[PDB]
Amino acid sequence: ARAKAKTRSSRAGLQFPVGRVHRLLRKGNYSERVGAGAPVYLAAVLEYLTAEIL
DNA sequence: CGTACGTGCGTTTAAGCGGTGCTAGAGCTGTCTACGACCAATTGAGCGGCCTCGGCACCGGGATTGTGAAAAAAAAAAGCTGCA
Ligand SMILES: [Ca+2]
Ligand SMILES: [Ca+2]
Ligand SMILES: [Ca+2]
Ligand SMILES: [Cl-]
Question: Which UniProt keywords apply?
């Protein structure tokens, strides 16, 4: 148990910050609990809507 | 000034009622654990700060585009007949 480094954005194959998105969900008063996929799905959508506009 | 719509007739239709019978599926229970909160410790991604240098704002000057008058051609249109 000392095996560190990887980011969730990298796991999901994304550019947008999954971790940040997660925190933002958690800190936003949206729901008491937040699934582990919730931010991944969301971030990916924001990536796509961002990419489409650009 | 033309005919698209409102009125009002007689005829036609199926909405609404009040009821009966069948059951999908809404919604409830109780059980049990995978998952998410929280936690602390650990660490590298993203922040501010800084420096650079190439895109783009600004320029002048000439090429090209777009409008309007004026003169002119084409145009419908306007006072005058004849002939019936
Ligand atoms: Ca479960
Ligand atoms: Ca910066
Ligand atoms: Ca540059
Ligand atoms: Cl989830």
Answer: Acetylation, Chromosome, Citrullination, DNA-binding, Hydroxylation, Isopeptide bond, Methylation, Nucleosome core, Nucleus, Phosphoprotein, Ubl conjugation
Resolution (A): 2.8
A19 close to A8: Cβ distance less than 8 angstroms: yes
Q: Which nucleotide is nearest to A7 (CA to C1')?
A: B45
Structure-block tokens of residue A40: 């991944």
Experimental technique behind these coordinates: X-ray
- List protein-proximal bases of chain B (any atom < 7 A from a CB): 35-37, 42-46
State how far the Cα of A21 lies from the Cα of A17, in Å rounded to an integer: 6
d(CA A48, CA A40): 12
